[PDB]
Design an enzyme around this catalytic site. Structure first.
Site, PDB file in Angstrom:
ATOM      1  N   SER A 250     -62.260   6.946 -10.491  1.00 43.91           N
ATOM      2  CA  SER A 250     -61.352   6.002 -11.284  1.00 43.91           C
ATOM      3  C   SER A 250     -59.864   6.014 -11.387  1.00 43.91           C
ATOM      4  O   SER A 250     -59.258   5.806 -10.213  1.00 43.91           O
ATOM      5  CB  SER A 250     -61.836   5.700 -12.858  1.00 43.91           C
ATOM      6  OG  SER A 250     -61.102   4.661 -13.368  1.00 43.91           O
ATOM      7  N   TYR A 251     -59.181   6.535 -12.186  1.00 46.39           N
ATOM      8  CA  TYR A 251     -57.819   6.579 -12.355  1.00 46.39           C
ATOM      9  C   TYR A 251     -57.558   7.872 -11.478  1.00 46.39           C
ATOM     10  O   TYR A 251     -56.571   7.875 -10.610  1.00 46.39           O
ATOM     11  CB  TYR A 251     -57.216   7.038 -13.919  1.00 46.39           C
ATOM     12  CG  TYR A 251     -55.973   7.260 -14.103  1.00 46.39           C
ATOM     13  CD1 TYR A 251     -55.152   8.201 -13.668  1.00 46.39           C
ATOM     14  CD2 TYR A 251     -55.215   6.076 -14.520  1.00 46.39           C
ATOM     15  CE1 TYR A 251     -53.629   8.133 -13.724  1.00 46.39           C
ATOM     16  CE2 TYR A 251     -54.032   6.231 -14.769  1.00 46.39           C
ATOM     17  CZ  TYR A 251     -52.988   7.099 -14.270  1.00 46.39           C
ATOM     18  OH  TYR A 251     -51.852   7.235 -14.578  1.00 46.39           O
TER      19      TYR A 251
ATOM     20  N   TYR B 245     -58.047  14.192 -12.827  1.00 47.91           N
ATOM     21  CA  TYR B 245     -58.148  12.671 -13.343  1.00 47.91           C
ATOM     22  C   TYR B 245     -56.573  12.417 -13.799  1.00 47.91           C
ATOM     23  O   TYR B 245     -56.333  11.106 -13.750  1.00 47.91           O
ATOM     24  CB  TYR B 245     -58.883  12.669 -14.704  1.00 47.91           C
ATOM     25  CG  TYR B 245     -59.105  11.651 -15.367  1.00 47.91           C
ATOM     26  CD1 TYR B 245     -60.097  10.502 -14.948  1.00 47.91           C
ATOM     27  CD2 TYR B 245     -58.698  11.049 -16.663  1.00 47.91           C
ATOM     28  CE1 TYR B 245     -60.347   9.266 -15.444  1.00 47.91           C
ATOM     29  CE2 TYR B 245     -58.862  10.135 -17.391  1.00 47.91           C
ATOM     30  CZ  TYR B 245     -59.729   9.167 -16.611  1.00 47.91           C
ATOM     31  OH  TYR B 245     -59.899   7.713 -17.465  1.00 47.91           O
TER      32      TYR B 245
ATOM     33  N   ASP C 115     -69.026  -4.017  -9.498  1.00 50.34           N
ATOM     34  CA  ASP C 115     -67.959  -3.287 -10.582  1.00 50.34           C
ATOM     35  C   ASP C 115     -67.432  -4.475 -11.452  1.00 50.34           C
ATOM     36  O   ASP C 115     -66.494  -5.189 -11.006  1.00 50.34           O
ATOM     37  CB  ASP C 115     -67.387  -2.665 -10.094  1.00 50.34           C
ATOM     38  CG  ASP C 115     -66.645  -1.297 -11.124  1.00 50.34           C
ATOM     39  OD1 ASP C 115     -66.968  -1.570 -12.197  1.00 50.34           O
ATOM     40  OD2 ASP C 115     -66.019  -0.527 -10.507  1.00 50.34           O
TER      41      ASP C 115
ATOM     42  N   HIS D 148     -69.670   0.388 -12.509  1.00 48.89           N
ATOM     43  CA  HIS D 148     -68.537   1.283 -12.292  1.00 48.89           C
ATOM     44  C   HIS D 148     -69.400   2.445 -12.431  1.00 48.89           C
ATOM     45  O   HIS D 148     -68.842   3.510 -11.596  1.00 48.89           O
ATOM     46  CB  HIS D 148     -67.705   1.067 -13.666  1.00 48.89           C
ATOM     47  CG  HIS D 148     -66.473   1.859 -13.621  1.00 48.89           C
ATOM     48  ND1 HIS D 148     -65.486   1.728 -12.418  1.00 48.89           N
ATOM     49  CD2 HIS D 148     -65.823   2.776 -14.217  1.00 48.89           C
ATOM     50  CE1 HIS D 148     -64.473   2.200 -12.492  1.00 48.89           C
ATOM     51  NE2 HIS D 148     -64.749   2.912 -13.658  1.00 48.89           N
TER      52      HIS D 148
END
Ligand SMILES: *[C@@H]1O[C@H](CO)[C@@H](O[C@@H]2O[C@H](CO)[C@@H](O[C@@H]3O[C@H](CO)[C@@H](O)[C@H](O[C@H]4O[C@H](CO)[C@@H](O)[C@H](O)[C@@H]4O[C@H]4O[C@H](CO)[C@@H](O)[C@H](O)[C@@H]4O)[C@@H]3O)[C@H](O)[C@H]2NC(C)=O)[C@H](O)[C@H]1NC(C)=O
Ligand SMILES: *[C@@H]1O[C@H](CO[C@@H]2O[C@@H](C)[C@@H](O)[C@@H](O)[C@@H]2O)[C@@H](O[C@@H]2O[C@H](CO)[C@@H](O)[C@H](O)[C@H]2NC(C)=O)[C@H](O)[C@H]1NC(C)=O
Ligand SMILES: *[C@@H]1O[C@H](CO)[C@@H](O[C@@H]2O[C@H](CO)[C@@H](O)[C@H](O)[C@H]2NC(C)=O)[C@H](O)[C@H]1NC(C)=O
Ligand SMILES: *[C@@H]1O[C@H](CO)[C@@H](O[C@@H]2O[C@H](CO)[C@@H](O)[C@H](O)[C@H]2NC(C)=O)[C@H](O)[C@H]1NC(C)=O
Ligand SMILES: *[C@@H]1O[C@H](CO)[C@@H](O[C@@H]2O[C@H](CO)[C@@H](O)[C@H](O)[C@H]2NC(C)=O)[C@H](O)[C@H]1NC(C)=O
Ligand SMILES: *[C@@H]1O[C@H](CO)[C@@H](O[C@@H]2O[C@H](CO)[C@@H](O)[C@H](O)[C@H]2NC(C)=O)[C@H](O)[C@H]1NC(C)=O
Ligand SMILES: *[C@@H]1O[C@H](CO)[C@@H](O)[C@H](O)[C@H]1NC(C)=O
Ligand SMILES: *[C@@H]1O[C@H](CO)[C@@H](O)[C@H](O)[C@H]1NC(C)=O
Ligand SMILES: *[C@@H]1O[C@H](CO)[C@@H](O)[C@H](O)[C@H]1NC(C)=O
Ligand SMILES: *[C@@H]1O[C@H](CO)[C@@H](O)[C@H](O)[C@H]1NC(C)=O
Ligand SMILES: *[C@@H]1O[C@H](CO)[C@@H](O)[C@H](O)[C@H]1NC(C)=O
Ligand SMILES: *[C@@H]1O[C@H](CO)[C@@H](O)[C@H](O)[C@H]1NC(C)=O
Ligand SMILES: *[C@@H]1O[C@H](CO)[C@@H](O)[C@H](O)[C@H]1NC(C)=O
Ligand SMILES: *[C@@H]1O[C@H](CO)[C@@H](O)[C@H](O)[C@H]1NC(C)=O
Ligand SMILES: *[C@@H]1O[C@H](CO)[C@@H](O)[C@H](O)[C@H]1NC(C)=O
Ligand SMILES: *[C@@H]1O[C@H](CO)[C@@H](O)[C@H](O)[C@H]1NC(C)=O
Lengths: 725, 207, 725
Positions: C592-593, C509, C670, C702
């Site tokens: 995501s990140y 992450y 999203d 998302h």
């Protein structure tokens, strides 16, 4: 041992086919472009001369995309700043160059962002469309006149077509028609006030922070359709003091009860025009002939001149009703219609009488009428050897109909079987184009005694290169089902052996009135698969195909997605019965309508196929446009054919996909078949739990014709087939 | 002489912070007609009797007027801590004066403005990271620095304004916030009359 | 042999963890739900009673989603017709049931499509939001009162938050705050008049013919942000004849010179409130304390009562400034603030003085403050054994700060190293929750002398089930780089042998203030990979990770995509040298990140990794929201940090993707990370000629949390990993 046709050869275009494009400017001379020089050729002797040199092009200061030359030969039209829109539409900038005094005109220029421009048949008149309005210039130096004042963006169109008319009716962007000697101008107006809109997102360049939405007036099945009007104007009476006047021609009473279309516009003489109208239920059409009254300055259309065409087993024409070919005096015309047995032939009409007399008969079809003189008629048919995939040129004597002569049957039997022609102004010379089983060939002939003058192109350079490369072969044959003959084609690997086993790939389009088995020489993706990977590629024509009769063609009326799907499966079983086809390794793929057929075949549960690819498919017939869908299916309304709309859905067969592999590809900016259709297919497969592969292309239209996107899609598809086999 | 009170009753009245001052010298006045013309809700006098100021000779007679709502009566008092006295207007007790709060009978030549208004806050910001935040308070009988912007009124309540100060003014950034109240049925006005008089220089005398 | 954890077990939830959720209603009682019945427990003895039986629920006739009970215990609020909007937003209908006289109230019903409802802390008042307006009911059977009249869709919000405030600032949809005894009500208002809009497409089932377009106000980096106002109203003076009156509180002058936010609201006493403000450049914050004046009815805020928080190395707070904890008299409070050495501890403030006084110190951080009493203060830290991944409960004496006692350190040294607490009204009883290395455990304790009363849950049922299933183990250790310790974790297959070689998968992450190495017990996709496929799954915390100091956390200030990317690469090299890892099979994936970091790692060209998966990645920091992005990067302007915006994109590293395998997954609908970001990656890779794989999910947000899509995505990724290895 030697080299083979590779994927890089197809993608980089190593081996090229060279053509010969000419424009007839008179009865004796034509134009050609070589080393960026325009040359004038004499057809009789072959002598040539220079018309425009490339040094002048260098000093213009821009990149020229295309050119146009006035009929009299005094002016030339230059086009630059090309921006593409839809399939036949674009926006550009224009300049006019005078050949006599050798200079460029700088007074009263054509404005930027022009949508269409055309010359008159005789003289040097101009008519262009700017901001959905029509302008006329009598001389290039003089200012212009305004004809229409009601143009608006995405609402009212003058002189140009909307989406459905450009794509499904006219196959063109122009809606302007000049008189034979340049006196009158006719145009059509479209109104899109109540038509719904389709919206999709466009991402554009990396620097754009917020995506933009594109809105297009698009009618789906059962929606509201645009309205059309027709006008005629006189250009010899234009004055700058007062506005111009337009006279309207009204549709016949039999078409004003409900919705209707405009199909064809043709000029008969200097003061006579013909129009064709079609109902929304596309099995009834009416043709009207109209005249000009000098006393009142109005156009009159009387009942006794009307002709009616109708069908009881399907729709009118192949895609649209055919166009008439009038004689010089304008009291009779020729046209292609279907006879009692269901084959299309030429019949001869009179403007006053109702019956007409056929001049051709037999178990074959006439493709088109090419030229008409005072003594002969020229047409293209597929009569020779009873092969529906062939094309040849014939001529018939008007005095006695028994005398028919073939002009291209025996020029080169082993090399040439597919032909096309281009005639001169008065049909004294014509050019024959042969795609052929073998290499393309171009020749020029004279019509006085059918004597061959010379050879224009023979593709001798390509032949020398291909002698060192191992190339596939093509086979054409037929099979019999229910005492009916159906044709197929096969591309075979080099050094083919009957004892060995080969994998088979099936290419399908299967659209109404389509042909996939013909005698054309091609270099495409199929050549790579056979030459390098040793894969057989085959195509089949079944029920619903064209150029064979109305009985075969009209079998899928109001029942789309039933008979063409079953025919493809039966052909694969027949192929497997042959000794050289492997039962385990069989695949299928297609594009557009072919993707729809591929999806239903994989979901049929037959167990014959293993893997398949669908590129931009159709899933539900209520998502497509009205003109195409309602032609074969009818309205989506309970009292008329609503049950079959629901039974022909790809999403209803998602469960059967567990037994096969599947690949799905679609472009996000697709405007013909929307991205909505592929999105719904994937959602149905996820709900039941099927494993599949997908791919999307950003800012790509229906064709996926970008240089980078073209190379990417075929590399991706090649890897998928190799692992499946 | 013959000093005129016509501008007091002519034209659109101004706001509370933009009060207009009229000075009278060597003239005859008639305060009875002005007081009788307006319906006096409140009349108070400090340092002088109401009748004495009406019939008493003076040297200089100065009147400052502004538009003021009737509801906010408690804020204009000799002792108060509201926003009116801190920023907008502070009364001066250097000389005896009278405060009159009345309403226009609407039969005169007065044009009702859009709405009342006043300044909630007015301060100056400076320092290393703009963190000093020194408030500014108006001296009695003076003008507010925030009055340069919004001379006539506010479009909506809670407007915020910023301006850059020069070296002579003091430096920093000036910030101010204003308020707005709805208009009543009839016009309401406020009058402040103060006199600076000498025994031997009583030029102004009642008529 | 014995069975192993399988993919079906994870997808169908075969093994379940049991929970114990309670709601405190007094100092010695709480509520619980057993078999759809509400029960009342006394913490001292363990007695039980029935508060509401399940027969009453079935009489209503609707499915009841949730319930709420008034503080006095006389009314219960029922909710149905649940429709979700965003992560923290929804819409539903409500009804009120009286417990004393046992019937359903049918007069003055709460309207349909209500957005938010809340009770008062004392009594039975109600306040709800409908059509962006605030309403208040003094009694359930009486008519409502209207407070606001300016609400309008997508422009003005009263009592609720917009998208950016809900997601990044408040982490809630509510914007109503009650006074401690119900006298006052405070709310906030937002306009979005000048904020740009984002548009995407929604397809919405097969029956829909035209897709829908969704428009949401969304500020990107450098765009225009909304504005905020604050009001306070008095609920004891409401009347039907006259409209209500609201008093506004203005921001301090140090915040009005530019853009600013509102980040915290807290009540001190019955007539005192505290507000916190933050600048757009998030390294300067101000706290205000405001009181109530009875003479004027206004709210006065004093300059001498303001407190300033600044940061020189980076931003203020972990994600936002922390919240105060006031004493009973409201003349002092406690707060968490970073000290001179960069570690977060507790100050003690006086509302009239500027300076702190720190009561805790050391090389560890305080996580939060739980309860405050006149004698002791409770908090959670990670001091024990120097493990940043642990949590424990501590107590400190206010008279003497030398006496600190740990309440959960030695309860059971194994099986429990991660703790959470929940206190009662007067801090007389509390519940401890353990999610330590072993199975979860729930206990109840007293505060007078800290003795364990009873055990509420021990998960003994799941222990028996897992006794016959092979399960992985977990290891937590550290490595040294540049004389600094960094922590990592590893999931190991059963019967682990150091001699053999195993493939390695890295889960990343690597966001700011994040932790992936801890002592929590989980059953997830990583459990499947280790049990069945024999794969090591590892996570690493490097520069930018939280709970270790400002020196490590702030190292990535204004440089995103530089240090956290290289840290992951170096960790893989260190793992390879241990001895039990195969160098040829190493992969990486993220969310995501994590998708952003995974793509940057693959495009670096190190050659350590072979294949990778990125799901919903971030492509360019100019496509993401302003509040999050500007906290770590600043504005995108030439005068301030524009060069690094251009140098930190994934599309500039497309050429290096030719050495690895890549999989890209994104959702169409999203709203957090738009589909635009993944669309730009695909275009860049196609331009340079790189082969990869893709997958899109229709109408998915998302999280991709629908049951059908959840099972599909984890089955697809499993095939990719197995093929790569
Ligand atoms: C959410 O945000 C939106 C947008 O930010 C807010 O909408 C804005 O509202 C303000 C209201 O102040 C508005 O500003 C006015 O617009 C008027 C349009 O004509 C202007 O005329 C007006 O200027 C006059 O008023 C100023 C303040 O009083 C004066 O300083 C100025 O000199 C002008 O003076 C005129 O008026 C006076 C009388 O007051 C007169 O005597 C003078 O002779 C002169 O004629 C303001 O500029 C913005 O335009 C709005 N923005 C828009 C529409 O985009 C919205 O209000 C916010 N939400 C809520 C709930 O408030
Ligand atoms: C209570 O207020 C409403 C709304 O008025 C607006 O909001 C107020 C807070 C104030 O700022 C007003 O100036 C605003 O106009 C009143 O409803 C309005 O009433 C008038 C007169 O009857 C009418 O012309 C409007 O259309 C109404 N507006 C709406 C949205 O219905 C209401 O009358 C006020 N109540 C009382 C008792 O005065
Ligand atoms: C090509 O050459 C032929 C013959 O050399 C040209 O024909 C002659 O043209 C001239 C003037 O154009 C006439 O005076 C002769 O009578 C023509 N002779 C014949 C036999 O036709 C022809 O014009 C040339 N064309 C071009 C384009 O150069
Ligand atoms: C030709 O027609 C146009 C529009 O039908 C005329 O333009 C209008 O003129 C009137 C009178 O000046 C204006 O009030 C309108 O606003 C004009 N319309 C537009 C669209 O410009 C034009 O005057 C006509 N030409 C002549 C010579 O009369
Ligand atoms: C709690 O358990 C005890 C059983 O002893 C009961 O509580 C009693 O409640 C009554 C009524 O207020 C009191 O007068 C008694 O003093 C309580 N007993 C004790 C020991 O405190 C009751 O059965 C249970 N109550 C609930 C609410 O569950
Ligand atoms: C908050 O961040 C801003 C932006 O980096 C800091 O402003 C800089 O301050 C230094 C020190 O005086 C100047 O040299 C820079 O020129 C400033 N940058 C800009 C863009 O103005 C500000 O100092 C920070 N706040 C604190 C308290 O450190
Ligand atoms: C321009 O025309 C001349 C005429 O023959 C030719 O030689 C030359 O190659 C042409 N230039 C180009 C760039 O083709
Ligand atoms: C077309 O645009 C160019 C670029 O500004 C301009 O120079 C030219 O004059 C335009 N053409 C006309 C006909 O106005
Ligand atoms: C064109 O045709 C019209 C229609 O008869 C005729 O009046 C006109 O004279 C013709 N023009 C020329 C140049 O012959
Ligand atoms: C187009 O159609 C609308 C109604 O469908 C009509 O009001 C309008 O006048 C039409 N346009 C013209 C130019 O007549
Ligand atoms: C075909 O045309 C005939 C005659 O107009 C009509 O009765 C019939 O309904 C049409 N076909 C269909 C399917 O409606
Ligand atoms: C042949 O006839 C049978 C039965 O009539 C039918 O099922 C089949 O589809 C037909 N095949 C073709 C090619 O017409
Ligand atoms: C309802 O409550 C009774 C009493 O505890 C219990 O036996 C029964 O199982 C419950 N039924 C449901 C459906 O909750
Ligand atoms: C909510 O909707 C239902 C169904 O339309 C209706 O019966 C009910 O009265 C509505 N609620 C209110 C408070 O009006
Ligand atoms: C609640 O707080 C207010 C504010 O001080 C106070 O006046 C009131 O007495 C308190 N109690 C009740 C029951 O309102
Ligand atoms: C350690 O220091 C070296 C020297 O600059 C640097 O390259 C490396 O990234 C540093 N590693 C860590 C984990 O800080």
């Amino acid at each position: 041992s030697r080299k083979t046709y590779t994927l890089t050869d197809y993608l980089k275009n190593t081996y090229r086919l060279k053509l010969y494009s000419l424009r007839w400017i008179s009865d004796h001379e034509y134009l050609y472009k070589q080393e960026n020089n325009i040359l004038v050729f004499n057809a009789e002797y072959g002598n040539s001369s220079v018309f425009l040199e490339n040094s002048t092009f260098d000093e213009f200061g821009h990149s020229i995309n295309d050119y146009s030359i006035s009929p009299d030969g005094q002016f030339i039209l230059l086009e630059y700043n090309y921006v593409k829109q839809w399939r036949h539409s674009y926006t550009a900038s224009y300049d006019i160059y005078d050949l006599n005094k050798r200079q460029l005109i700088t007074e009263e220029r054509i404005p930027n962002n022009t949508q269409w421009v055309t010359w008159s048949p005789v003289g040097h008149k101009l008519a262009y469309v700017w901001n959905n309005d029509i302008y006329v210039k009598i001389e290039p130096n003089l200012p212009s006149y305004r004809i229409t004042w009601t143009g608006k963006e995405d609402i009212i169109y003058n002189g140009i077509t909307d989406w459905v008319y450009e794509e499904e009716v006219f196959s063109a962007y122009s809606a302007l028609w000049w008189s034979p000697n340049g006196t009158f101008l006719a145009y059509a107006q479209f109104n899109d006030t109540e038509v719904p809109l389709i919206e999709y997102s466009f991402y554009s360049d990396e620097s754009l922070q917020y995506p933009k939405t594109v809105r297009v007036p698009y009618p789906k099945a059962g929606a509201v359709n645009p309205t059309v009007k027709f006008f005629v104007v006189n250009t010899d009476s234009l004055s700058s003091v007062t506005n111009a006047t337009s006279i309207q021609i009204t549709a016949p009473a039999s078409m004003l009860i409900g919705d209707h279309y405009l199909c064809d516009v043709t000029w008969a003489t200097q003061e006579r025009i013909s129009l064709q109208w079609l109902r929304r239920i596309q099995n009834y059409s009416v043709m009207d002939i109209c005249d000009y009254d000098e006393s009142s300055g109005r156009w009159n259309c009387l009942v006794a001149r009307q002709h009616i065409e109708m069908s009881t087993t399907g729709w009118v024409g192949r895609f649209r009703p055919s166009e008439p070919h009038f004689t010089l005096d304008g009291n009779s015309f020729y046209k292609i219609i279907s006879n009692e047995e269901g084959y299309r032939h030429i019949c001869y009409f009179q403007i006053d009488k109702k019956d007409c007399t056929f001049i051709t008969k037999g178990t074959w079809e006439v493709i088109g009428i090419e030229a008409l003189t005072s003594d002969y008629l020229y047409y293209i048919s597929n009569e020779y050897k009873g092969m529906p995939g062939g094309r040849n040129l014939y001529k018939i004597q008007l005095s006695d109909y028994t005398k028919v002569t073939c002009l291209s049957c025996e020029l080169n039997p082993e090399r040439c079987q597919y032909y096309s022609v281009s005639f001169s102004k008065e049909a004294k010379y014509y050019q024959l184009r042969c795609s052929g089983p073998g290499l393309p060939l171009y020749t020029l002939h004279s019509s006085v005694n059918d004597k061959g003058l010379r050879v224009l192109e023979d593709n001798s350079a390509l032949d020398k290169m291909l002698q060192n490369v191992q190339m596939p072969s093509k086979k054409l044959d037929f099979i019999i089902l229910n005492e009916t003959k159906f044709w197929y084609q096969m591309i075979l690997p080099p050094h083919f052996d009957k004892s060995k086993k080969y994998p088979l790939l099936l290419d399908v389009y299967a659209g109404p009135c389509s042909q996939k088995a013909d005698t054309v020489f091609r270099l495409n993706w199929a050549t790579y698969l056979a030459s390098t990977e040793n894969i057989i590629v085959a195509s089949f024509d079944g029920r619903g195909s064209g150029y064979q009769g109305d009985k075969i063609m009209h079998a899928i009326n109001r029942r789309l997605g039933t008979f063409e799907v079953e025919d493809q499966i039966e052909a694969a079983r027949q192929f497997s019965k042959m000794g050289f086809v492997d039962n385990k390794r069989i695949a299928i793929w297609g594009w557009s309508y072919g993707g729809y057929v591929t999806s239903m075949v994989l979901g049929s549960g037959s167990g014959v196929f293993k893997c398949g690819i669908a590129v931009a498919p159709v899933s539900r017939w209520e998502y497509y446009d009205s003109v195409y869908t309602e032609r074969y299916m009818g309205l989506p309304t309970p009292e008329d054919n609503l049950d079959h709309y629901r039974n022909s859905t790809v999403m209803s067969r998602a469960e059967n996909f567990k037994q096969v592999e599947y690949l799905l590809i679609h472009g996000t900016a697709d405007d013909n078949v929307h991205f909505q259709q592929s999105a719904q297919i994937s959602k149905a497969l996820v709900d039941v739990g099927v494993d599949f592969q997908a791919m999307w292309y950003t800012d790509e239209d229906h064709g996926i014709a970008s240089s980078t996107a073209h190379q990417h899609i075929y590399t991706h598809m090649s890897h998928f087939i190799k692992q499946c086999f | 002489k013959e000093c005129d009170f016509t501008p007091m009753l002519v034209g659109v009245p101004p706001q509370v912070y933009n009060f207009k001052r009229l000075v009278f010298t060597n003239c005859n006045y008639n305060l009875t007609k002005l007081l009788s013309l307006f319906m006096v809700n409140e009349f108070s006098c400090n340092g002088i009797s109401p009748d004495a100021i009406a019939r008493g000779c003076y040297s200089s007679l100065t009147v400052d007027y502004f538009a003021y709502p009737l509801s906010m009566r408690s804020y204009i008092q000799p002792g108060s801590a509201g926003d009116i006295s801190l920023y907008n207007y502070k009364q001066s007790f250097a000389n005896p004066t009278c405060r009159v709060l009345a309403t226009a009978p609407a039969n005169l030549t007065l044009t009702k403005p859009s709405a009342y208004g006043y300044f909630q806050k007015c301060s100056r910001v400076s320092g290393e990271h703009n963190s000093v935040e020194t408030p500014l308070y108006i001296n009695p009988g003076e003008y507010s620095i925030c009055r340069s912007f919004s001379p006539y009124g506010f479009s909506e309540d809670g407007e915020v304004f910023r301006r850059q100060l020069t070296q002579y003014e003091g430096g920093g950034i000036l910030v101010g916030v204003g308020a707005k109240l709805a208009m009543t049925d009839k016009l309401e006005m406020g009058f402040i009359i103060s006199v600076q008089y000498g025994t031997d220089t009583n030029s102004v005398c009642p008529m």
